[PDB]
Amino acid sequence: APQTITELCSEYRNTQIYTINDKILSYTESMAGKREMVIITFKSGETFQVEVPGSQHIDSQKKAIERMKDTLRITYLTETKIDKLCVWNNKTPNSIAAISMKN
Amino acid sequence: APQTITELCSEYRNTQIYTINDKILSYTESMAGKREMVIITFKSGETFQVEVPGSQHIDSQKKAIERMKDTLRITYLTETKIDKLCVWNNKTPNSIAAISMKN
Amino acid sequence: APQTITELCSEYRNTQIYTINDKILSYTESMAGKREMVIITFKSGETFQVEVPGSQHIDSQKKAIERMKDTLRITYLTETKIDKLCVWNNKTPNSIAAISMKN
Amino acid sequence: APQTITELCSEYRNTQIYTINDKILSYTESMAGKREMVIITFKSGETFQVEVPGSQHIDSQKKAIERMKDTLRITYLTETKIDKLCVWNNKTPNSIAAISMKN
Amino acid sequence: APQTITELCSEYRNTQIYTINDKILSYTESMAGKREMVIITFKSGETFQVEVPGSQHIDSQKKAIERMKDTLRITYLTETKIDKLCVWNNKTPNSIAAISMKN
Numbered sequence A, B, C, D, E: 001a002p003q004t005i006t007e008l009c010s011e012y013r014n015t016q017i018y019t020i021n022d023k024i025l026s027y028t029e030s031m032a033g034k035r036e037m038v039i040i041t042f043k044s045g046e047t048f049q050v051e052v053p054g055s056q057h058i059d060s061q062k063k064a065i066e067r068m069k070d071t072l073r074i075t076y077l078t079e080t081k082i083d084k085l086c087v088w089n090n091k092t093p094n095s096i097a098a099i100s101m102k103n
């Protein structure tokens, strides 16, 4: 299995690593129909989303998707610094695939 | 996908943005039958609810409804400031569709 | 939909409001068969429970019962002050229907 | 229903109350097959477990088992003082049936 | 049932104990398809993973795998020191079977 987020990210096309090194500036969560998602922004001006579960997600990703949103909420509330985000760049906002945090 | 809560809110009928910019004043949670819900209030005098799951909700919203309630509880307990709320105004109290929080 | 704990409590047959205005003194949790419940007490001596799921409960209450127990634990662990509790008074300990907290 | 952990514990066979009055010394969690459990210890030299789910458990206990493990973890991480433990003494280490915390 | 992580670790093949006595240096979480996992690192330079659920896991481990990931996130966020890890050494990075922490 991959040993670092970069290793993991390099396994998928249409992805790139954003080296955030910062806490989340804003957290947005929606339970509106067809828009059950989370959006986060940073002081850098970058915006990212955890996508609404859909056709392109495999079954195994369902729990992971819910975990990622849990992670973003607690990271926001605790002001925990995010190191890097591996994101798909074929979506707007860019779509979160993986996250890493360094202490 | 929407980039902000304002963009997200604009996609729906009967919704509107309430700029809160304040922490929750009161949190109420009910496990009484047909009233399995959460009610939040602000010192401005505005009251909002996360609705009891009903037939208007689609399947993808079920986990989202539970998430929103989780978020309100931790937001209240931590005295975290809420920036905006996108709410359905055809319900009383106004029904929460989405929330945004900024540091 | 109800806008306060008193309003939802008043919808009921055999309930009453308890003004607590205090943090929880003790928290008890059981995973023993047929006694899967939570019991909390206050310095006043008053004792309450979140009942074991049973035939008197409608299906939509199942998830809410688990949420209420989650709330009581984090409320206890954070020493958060409870405002009021709506309880069904035909059970001992008095059975929690709803909880409210303000700060 | 029972008013206290001691009253609840007495409703069962092969159980007894351990007065701990102390925070958890160590926490051990396993996801190894057939050993999916939690083990805790105290400065007193006592060791306890939340058993691996099995035939001895009834359906209503499944979520309760998961809840107890959640409680032990958060109790350990917050250095929360445990009052009493109701344990089954026909298992080694003794098996947790209920827990109480007082502040 | 085993009384310590050492006793537990010894019941499986291809495992070994890693004495850590340190907080997690980095935490990585992925929701990418086929890579739904968590990777943790320590200042020692060691790297461990919670494997993607697969054919090597039995039913009972599914909830345990998700719990382990929950434990790693909260342990990382709280800078809690990890005492030891029981890992399967037939995977790269070494795969977490159990974890222990002492206060």
Ligand SMILES: Nc1ccc(O[C@H]2O[C@H](CO)[C@H](O)[C@H](O)[C@H]2O)cc1
Binding pocket: A012, A014, A051, A056, A057, A058, A061, A088, A090, A091, A095, E032, E033
């Ligand atoms: N095998 C494979 C092929 C495509 C792929 O990406 C697609 O799915 C992702 C969600 O899983 C993102 O939505 C991304 O934007 C989509 O383009 C991921 C894996």
Ligand SMILES: Nc1ccc(O[C@H]2O[C@H](CO)[C@H](O)[C@H](O)[C@H]2O)cc1
Binding pocket: A032, A033, B014, B051, B056, B057, B058, B061, B088, B090, B091, B095
């Ligand atoms: N397609 C579609 C489906 C539902 C809908 O709104 C209804 O459901 C909302 C929750 O989903 C709110 O309860 C709102 O008050 C209702 O009016 C609008 C459009």
Ligand SMILES: Nc1ccc(O[C@H]2O[C@H](CO)[C@H](O)[C@H](O)[C@H]2O)cc1
Binding pocket: B032, B033, C013, C014, C051, C056, C057, C058, C088, C089, C090, C091, C095
């Ligand atoms: N119409 C109606 C519905 C429920 C009701 O309360 C019953 O259910 C409660 C939990 O839902 C408590 O268990 C209470 O002790 C029971 O008496 C009373 C009237």
Ligand SMILES: Nc1ccc(O[C@H]2O[C@H](CO)[C@H](O)[C@H](O)[C@H]2O)cc1
Binding pocket: C032, C033, D012, D014, D051, D056, D057, D058, D061, D088, D090, D091, D095
């Ligand atoms: N009806 C009933 C049946 C068994 C019982 O105890 C058994 O199950 C417990 C788990 O629930 C503990 O594992 C205990 O060690 C076992 O002896 C209690 C009540």
Ligand SMILES: Nc1ccc(O[C@H]2O[C@H](CO)[C@H](O)[C@H](O)[C@H]2O)cc1
Binding pocket: D032, D033, E014, E051, E056, E057, E058, E061, E088, E090, E091, E095
């Ligand atoms: N009975 C039995 C047989 C094999 C076994 O190990 C395999 O599964 C583990 C997770 O369950 C790890 O993935 C390990 O690396 C695999 O080798 C565990 C138990």
